[PDB]
Design a protein around this motif. Structure first.
Motif, PDB file in Angstrom:
ATOM      1  N   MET A 273      46.532  43.671  47.406  1.00 48.57           N
ATOM      2  CA  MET A 273      46.865  42.921  48.718  1.00 48.57           C
ATOM      3  C   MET A 273      45.586  42.926  49.523  1.00 48.57           C
ATOM      4  N   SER A 274      45.788  42.573  50.827  1.00 48.13           N
ATOM      5  CA  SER A 274      44.843  42.048  51.635  1.00 48.13           C
ATOM      6  C   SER A 274      43.768  43.242  52.205  1.00 48.13           C
ATOM      7  N   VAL A 275      44.330  44.520  52.527  1.00 51.21           N
ATOM      8  CA  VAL A 275      43.462  45.431  53.066  1.00 51.21           C
ATOM      9  C   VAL A 275      43.023  46.243  51.561  1.00 51.21           C
ATOM     10  N   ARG A 276      43.765  46.581  50.843  1.00 51.39           N
ATOM     11  CA  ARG A 276      43.185  47.347  49.695  1.00 51.39           C
ATOM     12  C   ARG A 276      42.292  46.436  49.015  1.00 51.39           C
ATOM     13  N   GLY A 277      42.493  45.202  48.787  1.00 51.98           N
ATOM     14  CA  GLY A 277      41.460  44.242  48.137  1.00 51.98           C
ATOM     15  C   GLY A 277      40.001  44.262  48.732  1.00 51.98           C
ATOM     16  N   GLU A 278      40.036  44.260  49.976  1.00 46.91           N
ATOM     17  CA  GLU A 278      38.909  44.405  50.554  1.00 46.91           C
ATOM     18  C   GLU A 278      37.883  45.548  50.103  1.00 46.91           C
ATOM     19  N   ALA A 279      38.670  46.469  50.184  1.00 43.40           N
ATOM     20  CA  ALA A 279      38.021  47.850  49.344  1.00 43.40           C
ATOM     21  C   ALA A 279      37.721  48.107  47.972  1.00 43.40           C
ATOM     22  N   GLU A 280      38.656  47.340  47.138  1.00 43.17           N
ATOM     23  CA  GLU A 280      38.641  47.386  45.816  1.00 43.17           C
ATOM     24  C   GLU A 280      38.690  45.898  45.286  1.00 43.17           C
ATOM     25  N   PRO A 281      37.552  45.193  45.541  1.00 40.19           N
ATOM     26  CA  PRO A 281      37.559  43.900  45.031  1.00 40.19           C
ATOM     27  C   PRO A 281      37.676  43.590  43.579  1.00 40.19           C
ATOM     28  N   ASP A 282      37.022  44.339  42.894  1.00 41.28           N
ATOM     29  CA  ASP A 282      37.016  44.178  41.220  1.00 41.28           C
ATOM     30  C   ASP A 282      38.413  44.483  40.793  1.00 41.28           C
ATOM     31  N   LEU A 283      39.004  45.396  41.396  1.00 47.14           N
ATOM     32  CA  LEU A 283      40.435  45.282  40.676  1.00 47.14           C
ATOM     33  C   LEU A 283      41.379  44.158  41.292  1.00 47.14           C
ATOM     34  N   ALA A 284      41.299  43.962  42.654  1.00 47.77           N
ATOM     35  CA  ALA A 284      41.804  42.699  43.035  1.00 47.77           C
ATOM     36  C   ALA A 284      41.439  41.396  42.199  1.00 47.77           C
ATOM     37  N   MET A 285      40.348  41.169  41.799  1.00 46.29           N
ATOM     38  CA  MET A 285      39.903  39.962  40.919  1.00 46.29           C
ATOM     39  C   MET A 285      40.606  40.400  39.625  1.00 46.29           C
ATOM     40  N   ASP A 286      40.412  41.461  39.108  1.00 43.77           N
ATOM     41  CA  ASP A 286      41.100  41.509  37.607  1.00 43.77           C
ATOM     42  C   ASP A 286      42.330  41.282  37.782  1.00 43.77           C
ATOM     43  N   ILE A 287      43.093  41.822  38.454  1.00 51.35           N
ATOM     44  CA  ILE A 287      44.724  41.803  38.331  1.00 51.35           C
ATOM     45  C   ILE A 287      45.110  40.699  38.842  1.00 51.35           C
ATOM     46  N   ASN A 288      44.984  40.107  39.959  1.00 50.33           N
ATOM     47  CA  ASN A 288      45.406  38.841  40.726  1.00 50.33           C
ATOM     48  C   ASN A 288      45.160  37.549  39.745  1.00 50.33           C
ATOM     49  N   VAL A 289      43.877  37.535  39.218  1.00 49.12           N
ATOM     50  CA  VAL A 289      43.640  36.414  38.388  1.00 49.12           C
ATOM     51  C   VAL A 289      43.781  36.555  37.088  1.00 49.12           C
ATOM     52  N   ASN A 290      43.574  37.717  36.149  1.00 50.77           N
ATOM     53  CA  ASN A 290      43.866  37.965  34.928  1.00 50.77           C
ATOM     54  C   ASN A 290      45.325  37.867  34.384  1.00 50.77           C
ATOM     55  N   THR A 291      46.101  38.840  35.342  1.00 54.21           N
ATOM     56  CA  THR A 291      47.667  38.814  34.881  1.00 54.21           C
ATOM     57  C   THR A 291      48.180  37.682  35.001  1.00 54.21           C
ATOM     58  N   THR A 292      47.765  37.063  35.989  1.00 58.93           N
ATOM     59  CA  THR A 292      48.513  35.607  36.475  1.00 58.93           C
ATOM     60  C   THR A 292      48.153  34.549  35.254  1.00 58.93           C
TER      61      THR A 292
END
Ligand SMILES: NC(=O)c1ccc[n+]([C@@H]2O[C@H](COP(=O)([O-])OP(=O)(O)OC[C@H]3O[C@@H](n4cnc5c(N)ncnc54)[C@H](O)[C@@H]3O)[C@@H](O)[C@H]2O)c1
Ligand SMILES: NC(=O)c1ccc[n+]([C@@H]2O[C@H](COP(=O)([O-])OP(=O)(O)OC[C@H]3O[C@@H](n4cnc5c(N)ncnc54)[C@H](O)[C@@H]3O)[C@@H](O)[C@H]2O)c1
Lengths: 319, 320
Positions: free
Chosen positions: A79-98
């Motif tokens: 989510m928004s604050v964590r993602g700014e600090a771990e963007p690679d994890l954000a992109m993996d999770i939010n894009v691929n799981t979906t």
């Protein structure tokens, strides 16, 4: 109705899993997450809780073959604050799981809900009573991944008939889960600070308003949208809101309910630049007219319930 | 002089861009790459600074960037709109993942990075006539969807890390060097070929379907110019650009003027129609014009003249 939940042990999942279990019965609901519930967690010891890493598409499909869902709530996201600090994890999770959830939704004819968020908007959205369709220029990678979630789900609907349903959730306030460093999570912190009688160091500026919603209204709405006949839905993605408040508006509310002054100092942290790019309030008329979205809590009803529940669920000093 | 890397370089855009950058900056300052190797009649066969690189191989993509040390990069591979509806898994793999790797590399090694978007990023809520840079985006293809993602991810890289990401939404591009394939705008390139061959063109786009288009020489001047512009002149990261708008029947009339004969064209609707119909008929490119000088020399008849004369020369089709 046989309901699969993924990412089920976080803030939304916890309460939604219990709500669906109660309504359709524990045997019709399957709850999964990449981690297991801790000892103190509300879903421990129960059966119909599985471990699944949604990044493993074959594992994902395996569980779906076995359980044969007609409904799926797909909740894993960074989510928004964590993602700014771990963007690679954000992109993996939010894009691929979906990606994998929608592909399974197509192949096994599942009605699939994937939540979006007000973080999908940014500073060109039109900040006052934001409509369902406007310019989308989010300033966080989380937001970016959610625009993508929205567009791709809607494409699966058009192309294959997939019954993709979604709402833009405002910031969600609940008791059952302890507070992080998330953007709207200051609200959940102030309740705790007021109970402990400690200093609240609020990172969001005192008069920055945001759309918000208390969890029981969120649960009613996440079930109601999914029970609705497809025919009634004029769109796949809907704004829903509860009420807008600023942190000074929340501090007051809490003072009225505790009849005692609380201690807040406002020093900006990362949540503030983020929140500021979000709308102050949403237009949710379409959700209201199409499928009955409604809200029973106001800010003071919510504070009264929060100040009662936190001491029960996490042993802070009662009021 | 910049050191330019071009990925996806053997395709329609890549072929003519690669040559332009080589002419303008020196072949020594230009590295181009693609997943396959060029076949012997390809304009880039037999040239130095032409590598095999699969952009899905992050390690490999990084290694070439390390060695070459580009200062500019044109990241071109994508699965486009008609193909993407049939091969969605491949579209999402290419269009998302290679893009992600490119941006990370741009961040890591300080590259000014251009990644084209498209009119296909818009859908039927965009505002169909003279569409703005900033509007509702509801693309009706997976390609379109992935390109909205590309726009927003690149922008976020500009804001969060200072990456000099630049882009334009290309309309239908028309060029002679490349043989036409199955894509939506490519009916146009086929019609030039059908005319020189005096065969039937069976067009899958309906005759009065107007679409924004541009001729390659103009698109090349713009692709280079956006990248030479100083950063402080750019009021945004993503710009609309067009050349001019035409329908299949307009294009047929324009070919008939130049040939001084009738072409045979039958309209049998194909999957390109629905897609194309969801796109803008025309674009507002005032921001691109004002900010960095985007400009256009060719109109539809200048373009036909040049296409009908160039195709024989480049491909041995029957002349004039
Ligand atoms: N809570 C809010 O205020 C809010 C607001 C708007 C939108 N949403 C959306 O609701 C959804 C749930 O949010 P939340 O507040 O419950 O977040 P959360 O972080 O509290 O819960 C997320 C859950 O996802 C799980 N997870 C992580 N990676 C996983 C993986 N690879 N496979 C399976 N599970 C994985 C985590 O273990 C966690 O239990 C998200 O899509 C979020 O964007 C939440
Ligand atoms: N041609 C147009 O009318 C048009 C319009 C709008 C946008 N664009 C954008 O321009 C870009 C290039 O388009 P084009 O028309 O030249 O495409 P094309 O299909 O002609 O060329 C694509 C090239 O990318 C390569 N490729 C595929 N997978 C790859 C990989 N994994 N790694 C490296 N290379 C790979 C292919 O081999 C090919 O050489 C795309 O991003 C496209 O969206 C083109």
């Amino acid at each position: 109705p046989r309901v699969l939940v993924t990412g089920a042990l976080g803030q939304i999942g916890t309460d939604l899993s219990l709500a669906l279990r109660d309504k359709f019965g524990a045997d019709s609901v399957l709850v999964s997450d990449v981690v297991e519930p801790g000892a103190k967690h509300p879903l421990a010891g129960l059966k119909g809780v599985e471990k699944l890493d949604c990044l493993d598409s074959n594992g994902f499909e395996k569980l779906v073959k076995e359980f044969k869902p007609t409904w799926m709530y797909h909740l894993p996201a960074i989510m928004s604050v964590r993602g700014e600090a771990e963007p690679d994890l954000a992109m993996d999770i939010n894009v691929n799981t979906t990606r994998y959830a929608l592909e399974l939704a197509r192949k096994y004819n599942i009605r699939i809900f994937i939540p979006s968020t007000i973080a999908a908007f940014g500073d060109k959205c039109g900040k006052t009573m934001t409509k369902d369709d406007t310019i989308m220029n989010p300033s966080t990678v989380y937001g970016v991944t959610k625009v993508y979630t929205e567009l791709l789900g809607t494409w699966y609907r058009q192309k294959y008939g997939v019954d993709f349903r979604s709402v833009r959730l405002p910031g969600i306030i609940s008791a059952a889960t302890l507070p992080g460093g998330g953007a709207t999570d200051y609200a959940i912190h102030m309740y705790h600070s007021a109970l402990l009688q400690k200093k609240c160091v609020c990172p969001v500026l005192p008069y920055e308003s945001l759309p918000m919603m208390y969890m029981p209204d969120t649960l009613n709405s996440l079930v109601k949208i999914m029970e609705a006949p497809l025919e009634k839905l004029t769109r796949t993605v809907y704004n829903i809101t509860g009420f807008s408040f600023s942190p000074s508006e929340l501090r007051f509310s809490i003072e009225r309910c505790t009849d005692r002054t609380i201690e807040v100092e406002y020093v900006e942290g990362p949540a503030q630049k983020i929140a500021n790019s979000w709308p102050d309030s949403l237009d949710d008329s379409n959700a209201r007219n199409d499928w009955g979205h409604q809200v029973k809590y106001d800010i003071d009803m919510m504070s009264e319930d929060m100040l009662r529940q936190i001491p029960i669920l996490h042993g802070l000093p009662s009021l």
